[PDB]
Design an enzyme around this catalytic site. Structure first.
Site, mmCIF file in Angstrom:
data_model
loop_
_atom_site.group_PDB
_atom_site.id
_atom_site.type_symbol
_atom_site.label_atom_id
_atom_site.label_comp_id
_atom_site.label_asym_id
_atom_site.label_seq_id
_atom_site.Cartn_x
_atom_site.Cartn_y
_atom_site.Cartn_z
ATOM 1 N N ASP A 1 -6.778 5.230 1.163
ATOM 2 C CA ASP A 1 -6.640 3.794 0.958
ATOM 3 C C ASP A 1 -8.005 3.120 0.866
ATOM 4 O O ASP A 1 -8.935 3.464 1.599
ATOM 5 C CB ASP A 1 -5.831 3.207 2.113
ATOM 6 C CG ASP A 1 -5.285 1.836 1.810
ATOM 7 O OD1 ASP A 1 -6.043 0.849 1.926
ATOM 8 O OD2 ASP A 1 -4.089 1.748 1.469
ATOM 9 N N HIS B 1 0.804 -1.212 0.000
ATOM 10 C CA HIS B 1 0.000 0.000 0.000
ATOM 11 C C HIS B 1 0.839 1.265 0.000
ATOM 12 O O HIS B 1 0.536 2.199 -0.744
ATOM 13 C CB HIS B 1 -0.939 0.001 1.210
ATOM 14 C CG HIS B 1 -2.034 -1.016 1.111
ATOM 15 N ND1 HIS B 1 -3.368 -0.673 1.101
ATOM 16 C CD2 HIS B 1 -1.992 -2.366 1.000
ATOM 17 C CE1 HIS B 1 -4.102 -1.767 0.993
ATOM 18 N NE2 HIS B 1 -3.290 -2.807 0.931
#
Ligand SMILES: O=c1ccn([C@@H]2O[C@H](COP(=O)(O)OP(=O)(O)O)[C@@H](O)[C@H]2O)c(=O)[nH]1
Ligand SMILES: O=C(CCc1ccc(O)cc1)c1c(O)cc(O)cc1O
Length: 454
Positions: A111, A22
């Site tokens: 995210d 990520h």
């Protein structure tokens, strides 16, 4: 002609969740935005699960001193899953730091694991807001489609095929569904159910992919074929690896090997094979007869590494590898992109984490897919549908069977002997460059987004 003014600044705030899978695409996205002359605020949940995240962030921030870092200090199960939940649970405490931003915020990209807590915060800011989805567009289609599956009273016990209209993997069998989604009380099962119905509230979804590898999923998502009313999906890949990521004996060893002769082996930043399965990998590498660069993890979290590599591999395997002089084995963070871009590397045994897939695509390196957990079987089949990799459907999720070194070596030789895979991987590499050139999908999408934010 009538004004001499500081031309307006597009200010983007970014919020990455846990894991190198990520952080890395968020910082590569950050670099792209900085090259479009955006001002970037980076929200950093601290401390990070892994040292690699810690060190990459430090290198990024020193490479780009103009970035505004907003510290996000977290209060004190898979360790990355635990961090996902902690960031989520503490997110409602970001509002004062986002409200006070100067210059005026233009857009907010967070995210995909943080949709539910962040959506009301983003709506309060009054700017276009988006998720960065870090997996494949095909996986995103599955994520978008999940409420349709989970509404069934026979879910999750009765579900044998997931066939989403028009996507790049037309039939996803039950054996490829991320295993936690089939356990009726898992973190990601609850996240899917709470977050996927809220996708329609976003201004868009950014995905690190491109038409050369996921043409069908991109078209299906943006044509209303997956879920009606989904926000636009922007293929802003491939994310090109950036200078700040680099940290020289590995490259010196690669410099000595013949072009295309080395098989690179890595299963990502947060996965560690069991001891017996790990040693079968080494047996298969030796049996393959090919040169290899094998990155080993003994623990999920790098901070937890506690045993020397010789003890992890065992005397007999170490002895065979040092005797044949064909391989290099490391239990450390490597510059994977530097390796994949090296002319010596001709193939990639990959867990098919999405960042690794798109890096292999960018460098035109054919893949032997060994999916282990999560989205990796779906991603492996995205690659295989494109004809530039193969994966063995019977090896199964990590820990279900012991894949033996004999069949690992046979699979390596099969992929390395297949020149049609190189041909297709080279066309993927060609299309990867088309995507970022003027008129390509990524260039078109970024210009659309910049114009909206202006
Ligand atoms: O020793 C390593 C291991 C991994 N990576 C990078 O870490 C990321 C792994 O992300 P991916 O989505 O492939 O899988 P995950 O780590 O989330 O399982 C990719 O950018 C790899 O290039 C790296 O640079 N060095
Ligand atoms: O199912 C997914 C899809 C990505 C995703 C995860 C969490 C989320 O909230 C939204 C999307 C998945 C897993 O299940 C487990 C993994 O190791 C990786 C992975 O990619």
């Amino acid at each position: 002609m009538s004004s001499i003014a500081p031309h307006p600044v597009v200010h983007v705030a970014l919020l990455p969740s846990a894991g190198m899978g990520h952080l890395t695409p968020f910082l590569r996205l950050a670099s792209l935005l900085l090259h479009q002359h955006c001002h970037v605020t980076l929200i950093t949940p601290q401390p990070t699960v892994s040292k690699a995240e810690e060190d990459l962030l430090s290198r990024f921030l020193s490479a780009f001193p103009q970035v505004n870092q907003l510290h996000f200090h977290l209060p004190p199960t898979d360790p990355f899953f635990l961090q996902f939940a902690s960031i989520r649970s503490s997110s409602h405490l970001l509002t004062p730091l986002l409200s006070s931003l100067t210059p005026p915020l233009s857009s907010f990209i967070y995210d995909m694991t943080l949709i539910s807590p962040l959506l009301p915060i983003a709506e309060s800011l009054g700017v276009p807001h988006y998720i960065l989805f870090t997996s494949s567009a095909t996986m995103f289609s599955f994520f978008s489609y999940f409420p349709t599956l989970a509404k069934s009273e026979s879910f999750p016990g009765k579900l044998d095929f997931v066939e989403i209209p028009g996507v790049s993997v037309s039939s996803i069998p039950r054996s490829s569904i991320p295993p936690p989604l089939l356990v009726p009380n898992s973190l990601f099962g609850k996240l899917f159910m709470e977050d996927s119905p809220k996708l329609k509230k976003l201004h868009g979804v950014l995905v690190n992919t491109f038409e050369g590898i996921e043409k069908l999923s991109l078209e299906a998502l943006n044509g209303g074929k997956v879920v009606k009313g989904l926000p636009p999906v922007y293929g802003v890949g491939p994310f090109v690896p950036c200078e700040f990521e680099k940290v020289e004996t590995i490259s010196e060893w690669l410099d000595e090997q013949p072009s295309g002769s080395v098989v690179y082996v890595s299963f990502g930043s947060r996965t560690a094979m069991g001891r017996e399965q790990l040693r079968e990998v080494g047996d298969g590498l030796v049996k393959s007869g090919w040169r290899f660069l094998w990155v080993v993890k003994d623990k999920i979290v790098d901070r937890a590494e506690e045993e020397g590599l010789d003890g992890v591999l065992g005397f007999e395997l170490v002895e065979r590898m040092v005797k044949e002089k064909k391989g290099l084995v490391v239990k450390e963070w490597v510059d994977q992109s530097e390796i994949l871009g090296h002319k010596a590397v001709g193939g990639f045994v990959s867990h098919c984490g999405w960042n690794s897939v798109v890096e292999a695509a960018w460098f035109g390196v054919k893949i032997l897919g060994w999916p282990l957990h999560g989205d990796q079987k779906i991603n492996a089949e995205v690659v295989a549908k494109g004809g530039w990799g193969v994966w063995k459907e019977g090896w199964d999720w990590e820990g279900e069977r012991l894949v033996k070194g004999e069949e690992i070596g046979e699979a390596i030789r099969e992929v390395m002997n297949d020149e049609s895979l190189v041909m297709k991987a080279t066309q993927v590499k060609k299309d990867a460059r088309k995507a970022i050139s003027v008129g390509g999908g990524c260039e078109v999408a970024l210009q659309k987004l910049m114009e909206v934010w202006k």
